[PDB]
């Protein structure tokens, strides 16, 4: 189970946050700030997985924007890297050569892309065409 | 009302956090004033701007009812932004979230499958224990539908309902009948996640769900010999999430059952050999395959194949694959204990690696790989790793040294030497709840007390800045001063222990402000316990008890007042209540 | 970027020499390592222009500790504008040569300090008073051998009280830097 | 910098 | 003694850099920012941050950070006075000191930073005589860098010789929530604008209580200043000797005096606000403002800043005189009147709406602050009796005086 | 617009003949640690002379001074026979690179006023300037207090500054 998904930049400011566990807002901001400082206090050769409170944090840099996921101690970390890559590919297939600016100005559309891919911390749509196709029909549905 | 893109641009044109907060509050004022006038047209964009506000980290508690109003409307874009706002704002402890159970239940019987999947997404993402009770039958009626788009979301809703309220788990039994016979892989993936959720939750249906083990084997079989597809394919291999989830389900069944492992063993050998290892995706499939193989009771010949695949995972130059190999060898330690020990030189080679996570799982794997054969041989390397580390690792290193030397001590003298070494070298990084275990093992060491008491005395005589070291040492000195000193009732030949400077250094840790006010209580109880066991010095323990009877520490003052009362009035009774105790287990 | 600026700084004509020094000061100010361009800007040091002299002095102030064994080639220029009739350039040279914190050139600049502790201009006198404390913080033994503490004590007693105030601040700095003997 | 493609190509 | 003076930005990168002693390693400036956030996180933010043996003494301007380092026991009052003094020096050298003005004026900022401090010791800090020999468009040093008169240059002439005096009062008031005054003081300021030729010797005459009691005329109206702060130009020894404000003034605008006294008189503008706060429904404000000075005086541009809840909405304002607008950027309402005559009491009513969902954290209660200004009016009673201007050439200059009373820290605590 | 370089040894009269080219009188000179850059307007060509000192700790700093110069002046002291050999070693190391090929060479033998001095031929075939190619060399009799040699040295630099009339 993916507990939460965080997106942030090189400046540490958050770009997207989806939480599949229930915990209050002060603990939310504290956990997010310390996790952002843990990821940003690491180099580019540092194995892409950190250990944090019996949850392995799977992160992967793509641009100035970072991508991060937190899973339990039963999941696959490399398949969580593939889950991050599939979410980046779904952002590619929706927006079309996606940059950070599309995430910043369409955070709600990136949220819809995450909801068409992951609900409850688990994958609902494995494939790439079905999720983007469902977002396209919900976009012309209005 | 301004648009969401204009608000995002206005946020990005800010120069500092304070001016950003002023323009946040200036937009939130107009949003709340538009909320007060009950405007139906711009409520969608106002709730979306408030969602951007809440993402930046600003209060949005006044938009929860407007999220409910956006859910309760008839427009799909309003429903979309309202369900996203429910997911982002409400949770289980927000208590406004109970007011949309009827709205989710109305949207689950909508004619539009995107409205239905929106409600399924919101319920499966953040439904509470109260929402999951009166919506579980609504979820289960969508688990029997022919729509795959609603079917996968209803299966993950059933996952969320089972995870939240686990006593509504038996009512999803006939919804999973012939659910693995569906052809589309998202529905198959969510069905496999549902089956492993009930199999991990309850063990009464493990043999009930073990009859679809050859069905899972056949699905993995045509998944592997599905050569190329333009869908469900990344980096040349087909359905990796489905393959990893199917192998995780095959790990969950058959861990204690034999015949499912014989039905699963051939395709475990086929997946473990005929899939590529040049990519991260195939490495993920091979890691889940080797976790399945070393968790089930598999064939011992291909257990050696699992050894070889973990070896070529270990000497992979990629740090992700080295982390994966360390985590898998930590996952299987209790089984094939002979077959983990040959990688110990590689494990202590990555113990000195620069990566934090690599050296952390290498430390935990070395601690799990400590046994009773060459415990000294790993113990010099573990004390080297303790003495030569960046100091975030020292608490976990000292704790693992404590359980390793507790579990696999060949002798008590070596155990006392290594616990003195880790107490003197680690020091302040020693966790304070290990001090009862250290005192318990020292009191269980009945045949030698004088050597460990003398070593603790010599360690404090160097320095006493280390609070668990002085907490062990004060208790040991106060309990065993009667053999710390020996035959020293009068003046004699000059020996290094002469029954005064022990009480002087106990006085020193009492007076010093570099104590944590628990070791002062340990030192005061030590000084009181030394009054029975010392027959040479008199009227010094009494005055050092007497000057501590007016302390600002209330426990220290209560202890010294009771000990001063015993000294003044009941001095003949102190040997009856200050004697040694028998040991405990 | 480096060789082109080196060739433009190694040219002859004065305003593009000043612009090359101005952009090497600006590239230090934006925070990049530019210490490999040291002899090209050090070679344009005796100039009639004073803004150019100030920028070359600033480069020599913050780029001589990084290259200690090769920044010896500025001392004769330092002692030659420690003797010019402009007391602003004289005090600027004294202030800058106190800030070169390498050890083997400080014996070569004790004579202009001795000349500038003695002249009639109080601006260069109060600069040389602080330069005595700078050279004491570099080499207290060399300052005690040259005898600058006696003429710093004599600068408490003179007129023009900024000279006596800078001498008081310098002698107080030397007094707490002392081992509390004499 | 922010207008740059997320995927590595 | 500052080892190095840095100018930074909000991110904390070095905008311009200057080394004085070299005992602090120059690359330690990148440790200043995360020490600042980790001290701001615990609530242990201090002007003096420490990194082992290196102490960071910093001030914060409107856009920049001005940090000074030291390895030893530095005179930290001297360091902070120096940092505010070069903030003042850069503010008179340029229009305003921001992040942008460092980059195009870096040559003159480097020349200024070489001139202002030498080896941890401030040397020449007057901008008017500092502009004589280093400019942005260099001669011999002037005598006034090293003269006894270090603030005023010889050889400046004016066709019309005028002195302008601005006796500015700042009333500081702090009352409790119950309505009793617990702090009421006046901090004054005589800002002088000097346009004089030559070397004038100026004698300021005031109605000092100590001077009037020492003379023997202490029966008339006088002010009892608790403390007096003077400029560098004022002869402090003869001020202590015979209460004489004698000075050779600097050219241009400068602050000569800053006095301080406590008054038992009633506050000039009195605010009574009763808050009718209802939980989850609305909050109501009933604010009455009365002016307790004389009726011939008039306070201009008074702004009564009253704090509102941050989640409040839909304001309804009823007022008698003035206009009241909602400022949610400061989470407050201000009540702006244009003219407030004495003896008049005005009424304001404000109603907001509150959310049904409470906020997660508590708000806090800022006080009510008013922003009045009463010209041609002094509240302590200080009058400038004379200004004797003595010059060796001999002329008749005209001293012009005006008296402004404005707010200082004029706070009124709420419930 | 043109640059030369003047190097040498200790006590070679080097900054004194530089200041005699500058103004005309000899001032009191210290041993030059760094450099001296002077220009002199003489027969309508700007002559910028780069005097660099010649001490023992100072010698290997000349490698930047060979950049962007097409004239060389070597001043050799005529009284010190034991350091003519390290002058030989200095010249054979200083002319052993691949950078300064296009420059002319000038030898400045000085101190030809005292009776211990000599002519200008035994120094020439002792140094052996005929063993190095692609260079113009000869030597005239110069002096410190007379000022001779320097003006014909500037005429020498004039008539192989250019190839035309
Ligand atoms: N007046 C005068 N002095 C001479 C003459 N010849 C040699 N000197 C001496 O040479 C010294 C100057 O020599 P420079 O040419 O400056 O060489 P230097 O002193 O070693 O200094 P650098 O070589 O630049 O390091 C003077 O101090 C004199 O003692 C001469 O002909 N006339
Ligand atoms: Mg010479």
From Swiss-Prot, chain A:
GO terms for molecular function: clathrin adaptor activity. It comes from the Eukaryota. InterPro entries: AP1_sigma, AP_complex_ssu, AP_mu_sigma_su, Clathrin_sm-chain_CS, Longin-like_dom_sf. GO terms for cellular component: AP-1 adaptor complex; clathrin-coated pit; cytoplasmic vesicle membrane; cytosol; early endosome; Golgi membrane; intracellular membrane-bounded organelle; lysosomal membrane. CDD domains: AP1_sigma (cd14831). Keywords: Coated pit, Cytoplasmic vesicle, Disease variant, Golgi apparatus, Membrane, Protein transport, Transport. Its main location: Golgi. The keyword Magnesium does not apply. Disulfide bonds: none annotated. Widely expressed. It holds the Pfam family Clat_adaptor_s. GO terms for biological process: intracellular protein transport; melanosome assembly; platelet dense granule organization; protein targeting; vesicle-mediated transport. Changing residue 4 to C: Risk factor for PSORS15; results in decreased protein levels. It is found in: Golgi apparatus; Cytoplasmic vesicle membrane; Membrane, Clathrin-coated pit. It is a peripheral membrane protein. PANTHER family: ADAPTOR COMPLEXES SMALL SUBUNIT FAMILY. It is linked to Psoriasis 15, pustular: A form of pustular psoriasis, a life-threatening disease defined by repeated flares of sudden onset consisting of diffuse erythematous skin eruption characterized by rapid coverage with pustules, high-grade fever, asthenia, marked leukocytosis, and elevated serum levels of C-reactive protein. Belongs to the adaptor complexes small subunit family. This is AP-1 complex subunit sigma-3. The gene is AP1S3.
Swiss-Prot record, chain D:
Changing residue 2 to A: Does not affect ability to activate IRF3. Changing residue 7 to A: Abolished ability to induce the production of type I interferon. Changing residue 8 to A/N/C: Induces a decrease in phosphorylation by TBK1. Abolished ability to activate IRF3. It comes from the Eukaryota. Disulfide bonds: none annotated. Phosphorylation by TBK1 leads to activation and production of IFN-beta. Following cyclic nucleotide (c-di-GMP or cGAMP)-binding, activation and translocation from the endoplasmic reticulum, STING1 is phosphorylated by TBK1 at Ser-8 in the pLxIS motif. The phosphorylated pLxIS motif constitutes an IRF3-binding motif, leading to recruitment of the transcription factor IRF3 to induce type-I interferons and other cytokines. The phosphorylated pLxIS motif facilitates SENP2 recruitment during late phase of viral infection. Phosphorylated on tyrosine residues upon MHC-II aggregation. A motif (pLxIS motif) lies at residues 5-8. The modification Phosphoserine is found at residue 8. Ubiquitously expressed. Expressed in skin endothelial cells, alveolar type 2 pneumocytes, bronchial epithelium and alveolar macrophages. It is found in: Endoplasmic reticulum membrane; Cytoplasm, Perinuclear region; Endoplasmic reticulum-Golgi intermediate compartment membrane; Golgi apparatus membrane. Belongs to the STING family. This is Stimulator of interferon genes protein. It comes from Homo sapiens. The lineage of its organism: Eukaryota, Metazoa, Chordata, Craniata, Vertebrata. The chain holds residues 359 to 367 of 379 of the full protein.
UniProtKB/Swiss-Prot annotation, chain E:
InterPro entries: Adaptor_comp_med_subunit (IPR050431), AP2_Mu_C_sf (IPR036168), AP_mu_sigma_su (IPR022775), Clathrin_mu (IPR001392), Clathrin_mu_CS (IPR018240), Longin-like_dom_sf (IPR011012), MHD (IPR028565). Pfam families: Adap_comp_sub, Clat_adaptor_s. Keywords: Acetylation, Cytoplasmic vesicle, Golgi apparatus, Membrane, Phosphoprotein, Protein transport, Transport. It is a peripheral membrane protein. Phosphorylation of membrane-bound AP1M1/AP1M2 increases its affinity for sorting signals. It is found in: Golgi apparatus; Cytoplasmic vesicle, Clathrin-coated vesicle membrane. GO terms for cellular component: AP-1 adaptor complex; cytosol; early endosome; lysosomal membrane; synapse; trans-Golgi network; trans-Golgi network membrane. Its main location: Golgi. The modification Phosphothreonine is found at residues 144, 146, 215. Residues 160-413 form the MHD domain. Transmembrane segments: none annotated. One of its GO terms (biological process) is platelet dense granule organization. The modification N-acetylserine is found at residue 1. Adaptor protein complex 1 (AP-1) is a heterotetramer composed of two large adaptins (gamma-type subunit AP1G1 and beta-type subunit AP1B1), a medium adaptin (mu-type subunit AP1M1 or AP1M2) and a small adaptin (sigma-type subunit AP1S1 or AP1S2 or AP1S3). Interacts with MARCHF11. Belongs to the adaptor complexes medium subunit family. PANTHER family: AP COMPLEX SUBUNIT MU (PTHR10529). This is AP-1 complex subunit mu-1. It comes from Mus musculus.
Curated annotation (Swiss-Prot), chain F:
GO terms for cellular component: cell leading edge; cytoplasm; cytosol; extracellular exosome; focal adhesion; Golgi membrane; neuron projection; plasma membrane. It catalyses: GTP + H2O = GDP + phosphate + H(+). GO terms for molecular function: GTP binding; GTPase activity; magnesium ion binding; protein domain specific binding; RNA binding. GTP binds at residues 8-16, 110-113, 144. SUPFAM superfamilies: P-loop containing nucleoside triphosphate hydrolases. Its EC number is 3.6.5.2. One of its GO terms (biological process) is long-term synaptic depression. Belongs to the small GTPase superfamily. Arf family. It is linked to Periventricular nodular heterotopia 8: A form of periventricular nodular heterotopia, a disorder resulting from a defect in the pattern of neuronal migration in which ectopic collections of neurons lie along the lateral ventricles of the brain or just beneath, contiguously or in isolated patches. PVNH8 is an autosomal dominant disease characterized by developmental disabilities, speech delay, seizures and attention deficit-hyperactivity disorder. It comes from Homo sapiens. This is ADP-ribosylation factor 1. It is a lipid-anchor. It comes from the Eukaryota. Alternates between an inactive GDP-bound form and an active GTP-bound form. Intrinsic GTPase activity is almost undetectable in vitro. Activated by guanine nucleotide-exchange factors (GEFs) and inactivated by GTPase-activating proteins (GAPs).
